[PDB]
Design a protein around this ligand. Sequence first.
Ligand SMILES: *[C@@H]1O[C@H](CO)[C@@H](O[C@@H]2O[C@H](CO)[C@@H](O)[C@H](O)[C@H]2NC(C)=O)[C@H](O)[C@H]1NC(C)=O
Ligand SMILES: *[C@@H]1O[C@H](CO)[C@@H](O[C@@H]2O[C@H](CO)[C@@H](O)[C@H](O)[C@H]2NC(C)=O)[C@H](O)[C@H]1NC(C)=O
Ligand SMILES: *[C@@H]1O[C@H](CO)[C@@H](O[C@@H]2O[C@H](CO)[C@@H](O)[C@H](O)[C@H]2NC(C)=O)[C@H](O)[C@H]1NC(C)=O
Ligand SMILES: *[C@@H]1O[C@H](CO)[C@@H](O[C@@H]2O[C@H](CO)[C@@H](O)[C@H](O)[C@H]2NC(C)=O)[C@H](O)[C@H]1NC(C)=O
Ligand SMILES: *[C@@H]1O[C@H](CO)[C@@H](O[C@@H]2O[C@H](CO)[C@@H](O)[C@H](O)[C@H]2NC(C)=O)[C@H](O)[C@H]1NC(C)=O
Ligand SMILES: *[C@@H]1O[C@H](CO)[C@@H](O[C@@H]2O[C@H](CO)[C@@H](O)[C@H](O)[C@H]2NC(C)=O)[C@H](O)[C@H]1NC(C)=O
Ligand SMILES: *[C@@H]1O[C@H](CO)[C@@H](O[C@@H]2O[C@H](CO)[C@@H](O)[C@H](O)[C@H]2NC(C)=O)[C@H](O)[C@H]1NC(C)=O
Ligand code: NAG
Ligand code: NAG
Ligand code: NAG
Ligand code: NAG
Ligand code: CA
Ligand code: CA
Ligand code: CA
Ligand code: CA
Lengths: 448, 448, 448, 448
Amino acid sequence: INDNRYINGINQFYFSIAEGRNLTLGPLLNMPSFIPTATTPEGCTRIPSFSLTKTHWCYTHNVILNGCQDHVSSNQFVSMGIIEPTSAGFPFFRTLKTLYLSDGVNRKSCSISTVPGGCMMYCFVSTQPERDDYFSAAPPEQRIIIMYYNDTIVERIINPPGVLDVWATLNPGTGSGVYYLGWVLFPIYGGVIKGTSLWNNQANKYFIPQMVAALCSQNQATQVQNAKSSYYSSWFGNRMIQSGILACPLRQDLTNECLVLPFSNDQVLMGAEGRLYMYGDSVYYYQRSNSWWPMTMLYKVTITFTNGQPSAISAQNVPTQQVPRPGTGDCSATNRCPGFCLTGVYADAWLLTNPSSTSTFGSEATFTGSYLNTATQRINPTMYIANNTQIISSQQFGSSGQEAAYGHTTCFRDTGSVMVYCIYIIELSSSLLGQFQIVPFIRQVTLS
Amino acid sequence: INDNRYINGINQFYFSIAEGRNLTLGPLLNMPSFIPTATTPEGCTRIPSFSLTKTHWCYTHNVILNGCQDHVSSNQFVSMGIIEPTSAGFPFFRTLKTLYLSDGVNRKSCSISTVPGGCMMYCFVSTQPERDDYFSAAPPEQRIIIMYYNDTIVERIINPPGVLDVWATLNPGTGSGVYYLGWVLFPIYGGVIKGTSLWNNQANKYFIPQMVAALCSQNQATQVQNAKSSYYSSWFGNRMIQSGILACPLRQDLTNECLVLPFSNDQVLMGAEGRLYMYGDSVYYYQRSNSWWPMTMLYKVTITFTNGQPSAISAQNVPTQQVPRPGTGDCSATNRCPGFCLTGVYADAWLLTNPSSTSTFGSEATFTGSYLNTATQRINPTMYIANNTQIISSQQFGSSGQEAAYGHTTCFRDTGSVMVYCIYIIELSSSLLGQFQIVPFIRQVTLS
Amino acid sequence: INDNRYINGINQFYFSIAEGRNLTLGPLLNMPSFIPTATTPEGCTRIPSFSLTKTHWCYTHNVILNGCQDHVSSNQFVSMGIIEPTSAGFPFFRTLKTLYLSDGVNRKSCSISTVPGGCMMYCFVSTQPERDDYFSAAPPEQRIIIMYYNDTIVERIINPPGVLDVWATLNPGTGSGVYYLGWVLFPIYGGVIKGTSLWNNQANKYFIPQMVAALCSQNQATQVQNAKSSYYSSWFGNRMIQSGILACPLRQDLTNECLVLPFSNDQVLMGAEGRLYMYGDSVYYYQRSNSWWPMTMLYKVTITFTNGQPSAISAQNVPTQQVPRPGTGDCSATNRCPGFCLTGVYADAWLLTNPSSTSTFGSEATFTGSYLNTATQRINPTMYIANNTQIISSQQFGSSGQEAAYGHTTCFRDTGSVMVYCIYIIELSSSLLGQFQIVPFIRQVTLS
Amino acid sequence: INDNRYINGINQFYFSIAEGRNLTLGPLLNMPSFIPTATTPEGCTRIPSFSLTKTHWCYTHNVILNGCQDHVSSNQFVSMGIIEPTSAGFPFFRTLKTLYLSDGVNRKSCSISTVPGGCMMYCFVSTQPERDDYFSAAPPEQRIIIMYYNDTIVERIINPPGVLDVWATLNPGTGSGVYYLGWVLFPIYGGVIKGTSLWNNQANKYFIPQMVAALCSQNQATQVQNAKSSYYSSWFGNRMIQSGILACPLRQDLTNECLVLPFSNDQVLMGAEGRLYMYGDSVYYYQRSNSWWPMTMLYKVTITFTNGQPSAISAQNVPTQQVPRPGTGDCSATNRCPGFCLTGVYADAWLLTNPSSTSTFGSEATFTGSYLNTATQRINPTMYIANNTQIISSQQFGSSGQEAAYGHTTCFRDTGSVMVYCIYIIELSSSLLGQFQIVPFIRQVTLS
Ligand SMILES: *[C@@H]1O[C@H](CO)[C@@H](O[C@@H]2O[C@H](CO)[C@@H](O)[C@H](O)[C@H]2NC(C)=O)[C@H](O)[C@H]1NC(C)=O
Ligand SMILES: *[C@@H]1O[C@H](CO)[C@@H](O[C@@H]2O[C@H](CO)[C@@H](O)[C@H](O)[C@H]2NC(C)=O)[C@H](O)[C@H]1NC(C)=O
Ligand SMILES: *[C@@H]1O[C@H](CO)[C@@H](O[C@@H]2O[C@H](CO)[C@@H](O)[C@H](O)[C@H]2NC(C)=O)[C@H](O)[C@H]1NC(C)=O
Ligand SMILES: *[C@@H]1O[C@H](CO)[C@@H](O[C@@H]2O[C@H](CO)[C@@H](O)[C@H](O)[C@H]2NC(C)=O)[C@H](O)[C@H]1NC(C)=O
Ligand SMILES: *[C@@H]1O[C@H](CO)[C@@H](O[C@@H]2O[C@H](CO)[C@@H](O)[C@H](O)[C@H]2NC(C)=O)[C@H](O)[C@H]1NC(C)=O
Ligand SMILES: *[C@@H]1O[C@H](CO)[C@@H](O[C@@H]2O[C@H](CO)[C@@H](O)[C@H](O)[C@H]2NC(C)=O)[C@H](O)[C@H]1NC(C)=O
Ligand SMILES: *[C@@H]1O[C@H](CO)[C@@H](O[C@@H]2O[C@H](CO)[C@@H](O)[C@H](O)[C@H]2NC(C)=O)[C@H](O)[C@H]1NC(C)=O
Ligand SMILES: *[C@H]1O[C@H](CO)[C@@H](O)[C@H](O)[C@H]1NC(C)=O
Ligand SMILES: *[C@H]1O[C@H](CO)[C@@H](O)[C@H](O)[C@H]1NC(C)=O
Ligand SMILES: *[C@H]1O[C@H](CO)[C@@H](O)[C@H](O)[C@H]1NC(C)=O
Ligand SMILES: *[C@H]1O[C@H](CO)[C@@H](O)[C@H](O)[C@H]1NC(C)=O
Ligand SMILES: [Ca+2]
Ligand SMILES: [Ca+2]
Ligand SMILES: [Ca+2]
Ligand SMILES: [Ca+2]
């Protein structure tokens, strides 16, 4: 279990709106990395997923032996441990167990989540190129593995209702899931078949961020028309790219009890990878900007239960225009107009301030994370702290041109020293060992 | 505990003399590294120590927050786990426990060893520059920490007899120690005070490798004179640099039961860092070539017990002229003549063949390891397989100029697939994160 | 252990009713304070708790680094020792052990109690403003730490039955607890949820001090109606503010054996901080006047055991109209009429005379303590000796306007010199170091 | 025993000459004071003595019940404990034992020192005004008390040779003593009788600080004449005021084994209170400037043993002109000319830098401490860091006019966080409780 210095400083809004204005990054601190490195120049470690809870943390990433492509074989590294203070005062992520799922099943795009006594991971079995998954009417196999600290492992192939013949594909969002009221929630996304109830109920819906108007040159009618078309991809089997949540009751005999809950396309953009968070009793969702709007998308999720079962989710967006991401073509970090896009990178963000503490939801929100500071290339990894319209603190890592990819940010507080630390797990391109080196950068978020 | 595929292929001579001639390296294999990386550009991880036994493995290295110098503060990372096969057939070092000794005590030059149920580590507390330790008549504090898999930790300050007022300094050799007949043996080295019994008993002794004559231009009388002088250092407080073994009985209340057993300077060169091995029931010793002879030094150690206690050690050298190490001045990889030197690098070697299987000890010995292939710079790390006079297989890592330091090699066999794997733990200079990246390179030693 | 001069003069009624009339305060005596001071102008030491028993004494207070607010971080100082005579004849509290609980857990409102061989402390973990605790349906975490004189420390998170879903919050009363018949009893208070059994069983109950009639202008029917409403707070989450006792069996593995015993709201006023005392074999309770009646509230508690376990408590009030406390608005020291109030200060009192020694319980009771002599400000600390209707001896400390807060009084006798000494631990506002300086004032209670 | 974070950062020179130039004070940190407060307005706590060693610390001060005068009765408070880190990272002085010597013996001007397993304290019994001690030919009684952590106390009346009929008086210097090579050394001072060997051997000797010439307007011949006369006091019985060291072998049956070693008046100024320090293996001495030179006086002491017994001491002054002290008349902080003076205050200083690390002893020395920043009044306590000619960092405490007296400074390092902390024990005039409040101010000495 985590040290007493951290058990009460996890999953919360650490700063008040007033304090949020005086936050700055501190120097990076050196700690023994708990994320394994590749041992060959061509080895590939990618797609991390991290979850920190009151008692412990869970971590996982995918491993490919040669290069970063391979839809036949890959292994998945899983790790778990706790946080304890060092003599210097800052955190040390103590790994207490390790697992390497290597058995022939090609588990991909996995999302992990902390659960009482262990970790619950959700993956889908890949057997062909991503694009082919969208064209095939049958969805890939879905699995959820529960790994207890007592070394018991239980993997189950799940068949949640409303998936077969509705979704051509279904993928975990790779971002961490969360344990909520006895259920494990995971972010999901995929392609929905034309003519299905979901497709019809989603017909004509669209979402346009609150700050797009002042930045977009098109008129309201044109924006609306383009926005509506952005949820359909001809490149990905003519499916409706959908975002949602997978709710699974914590059980060791899961079969069809998990529930697929799609977001209304009136509150969310085109489906993409994502992450779920817990700030106090409120659930939040991060949605990768893989569509036309290149800015960080965070939403407060309201979950509705009907007979002890999650029955519907509602999302409220924290309106911002900060922290863009590299994109291709007319969907670069500079784009501001609705239309169909299918490019971007995963770069979640953590809310250092409560969006509900302001009379108007998210009128003044502060968040931290990393982002690739460029218009179209996955280059220049840069850790930052930002508000709705500006970056108020940032430090680029390495020299310009430094390649990088995904970034997962998580913050917690030392209730002893009373400081906030954030860990920025970034996929860095390495020249020595492996294609990428996933680094758990850690530094303090100083108030002043 | 280790998988059934490895429990019977540890600490042995894997190949016959005939097979030794047809061994070659295989490609490096990608596995999740079990050695932690630094998370800052200036962080420094150095001086590893690794031990693999029938049941499990122990690992440790030193960590310095800024740069690789600091005689005031450092932490020590300890890790332990087992070996299990992956779906690809090769090993995965599964970490089952991690520890970060961060508490203000500057434990340095630590040597770790596997013990029933845990790891036993031996370190000395550094509080001043190395050179000052040799001038001060008092030796540094010596500690041995036992860490059980059940998380119980017992650290003890030891005061073995014959140390105070005899050794100006005493250091573990950093190379792994070994559990032997109820005792944990660690390699040690340090400086002995002039006038002490040890000094007198060692007076006029010297050792000259069997193959030095044919390579050295000086005559026998000159060699002998210079060899004798090589055990005394004016730069290091005018002490007799001595090599030896520290024998500690496995107990949780150690105080003065450990025994300091110095090697006869008639069988060993000037004291240096070292490692102890176990091949079947025989103990072997690796001695860093920090003196005039730049070639790999391995010895078969004969330990004598008197009343259940180690009372004397004898060393028999495996005569070779292969695998030189970078040195400074007239002590470069090209030197072959006796004289006083105090330069080199740690680069142990593993014996793939039994030196006693030949009518004349070590007449035909094969070993594997890594070495910095250059005359004076710690550059060009190169893994190899060699015999007494030649390198018969080798592959350099990275491009020329690639900086590196120490190298610890360990081999074991998959009694299932029947192949031998060797892990080459090398300190690599990194340009991205940290000063060094200690990498556990792994590859097969193919017969054919 | 305490000196022979005190072991037989602890926890008793020291004077007869006749003697009680001729008691006066003596000059303050100078002794080395055993309560630590802050070392910065803004440091804050507050909320003390003291316990003196036949063998030794326990002391503790909360420490906040900057200012006296902070619901994220605080440390708790614990101290223990004995009493010995000085050459001048008066007591010296000899500290024999000190402890500083600094680890990130925000232990607040702690109550300490003497136990055989050590101290037992009861605290709750604060993670948000007090008011929020009343609104949240879940109660804060509750912990009891046992600290033995032999330096062994055992802390346990307790979950006594009848707390979850009944009490929105639960707090120790900060006043000392007592070791009674193998159990440690602590005063508690908090808010009870509407609709719970406790709430229903307490419905329509109220208590009105015996001397309120002659001082209150409202009629009996109006008083009754207002009194009933005084146990409910709309400001504190619409809960029923309840007073009670927490009974814990002396064990090192406490989990859910402690018992929450609430007082009947027919014998006690609205819940508030409190203290438990031991006079011979009788248990007494002090209840802070945080409601409409501003006078010192002391009760003789009758505890009922059912199968070796405390099953019910009954309280009998010692009727007085002396020693008022500063309050806000219509609840100042001058108020005498029932109604809802939520203001006051902690100011316990010690009984120098047995209330049961009179034909009518407490008809003539004498007590000593300190009180802030003003109507609404926490100002003018004043030590005194009083009876049911009048103050018969008093001495203010410092000049008028001197700020102060809580006051804990404890008396004991020198069976050698045969004099009674009382220690008045008062929180004094300081201008030099820290916000407050908790002072252990000591003086004699002279007979004559 | 002290925490591992401090055991290796005690009694040393913490910074290099280069670093010494970039040192600044940090904010004061709040920790529970381990120095007891008075409990009456007139109570008087004065004359502290503190000693920190590798294993633990010792503390003591004198207590007078009414006012700060009284040559008949006083008690002496003794305390001992260790240092441990808090959750905030800074030190907490954990008191593990307390003692109050109250028995009728008026022990004054005590100096305490750490010894293996306890504390050794040296005091003299006062029975008349200080001045009378100088006129009486007989010296006061001298006692040394040893207090073990195991509660055993052994007090002995000592009669070291060469005291009777040589010294009219003898006093410990109140500054801490030190345990050195099996002996406890204490600073001493007193008046020597005219005609004695000591007096004759000291005849015509004098010392003039190296930097006095450039600041003094008198010529060399006048300075010399006045300097010589400064060691004789007509006000103090016409004695030669002498400084020295008392060496006592650690024994429980001391009688006349302690040795009085006077400093040569050619290397030291007129005798005054003092303190002894240990920096590595070197002993240092601080001499109160109670004579004409108002600047901090520190000396490196060379002790000579003859047959295992201290036989002679030699002092080498660290030449400075910084940190003056308040004085009376023509001996104020502004004075620079030799002559007879008998005024000043105790204000030791700690060397943050090694005076021997420079080609010319003390050519560039840095020290920290506190000083009363005024010319003649004991007012304006001010903590500082200074070099030979200037104060390079300082912060006054409280508002101007704030009365204060003695100041004892001690620094140590957190070998974990690698920061240096210094404790400034200052006698502060208080308006609330007691005449003085001795405060253990603590703050960091930051490098940068
Ligand atoms: C490791 O912990 C898990 C979690 O408690 C144990 O799981 C139990 O498994 C049994 C059947 O094998 C179920 O009937 C229980 O309901 C499970 N417990 C629950 C509710 O989580 C698992 O058995 C543990 N490993 C062992 C056997 O030691
Ligand atoms: C985000 O932060 C920026 C920078 O801190 C804010 O911009 C400042 O706004 C204030 C007005 O409140 C101006 O006085 C400053 O001049 C602005 N900084 C500059 C020069 O750009 C911005 O208001 C914040 N956005 C919000 C409200 O969330
Ligand atoms: C973890 O394993 C060790 C090794 O067995 C246990 O050590 C025992 O400790 C006790 C005293 O605490 C000794 O008297 C025994 O001799 C030790 N066993 C031996 C011989 O190794 C240790 O107690 C274990 N941890 C726990 C308490 O579970
Ligand atoms: C070490 O290995 C080398 C290379 O395999 C051996 O050299 C060969 O020796 C054989 C004779 O037995 C010759 O026929 C080959 O021509 C040699 N190789 C060449 C061309 O260098 C060497 O003998 C081995 N050393 C020993 C005996 O340990
Ligand atoms: C509390 O003490 C007061 C003062 O000592 C008592 O008042 C005195 O009562 C007697 C009668 O027994 C009168 O003769 C005095 O004149 C009263 N003192 C004055 C002048 O106020 C009071 O009776 C005591 N209260 C009780 C009975 O507990
Ligand atoms: C407390 O510790 C001291 C220090 O060791 C003990 O002192 C010993 O006292 C005896 C006589 O009473 C001497 O003969 C020894 O030489 C002392 N030990 C030394 C060398 O320091 C003391 O006895 C201890 N208290 C007890 C009795 O437990
Ligand atoms: C003591 O410190 C002072 C201030 O840091 C030193 O004075 C500085 O000396 C340098 C030359 O080395 C000048 O460039 C600066 O201008 C000086 N500071 C000022 C403006 O006063 C002083 O030299 C130090 N004394 C020594 C040598 O110990
Ligand atoms: C943050 O810093 C600004 C500038 O110094 C200050 O004015 C403001 O009060 C601070 N905000 C808070 C409340 O921390
Ligand atoms: C190794 O290879 C050589 C060359 O093919 C072969 O002649 C020899 O028999 C082999 N050695 C053994 C016994 O493995
Ligand atoms: C207390 O003092 C009064 C007045 O002197 C005296 O009459 C009375 O007897 C005393 N009470 C007792 C019994 O101590
Ligand atoms: C101290 O600070 C100065 C000014 O930044 C810098 O130039 C100097 O190198 C520092 N000294 C050292 C070596 O710490
Ligand atoms: Ca499909
Ligand atoms: Ca030494
Ligand atoms: Ca609550
Ligand atoms: Ca005298």
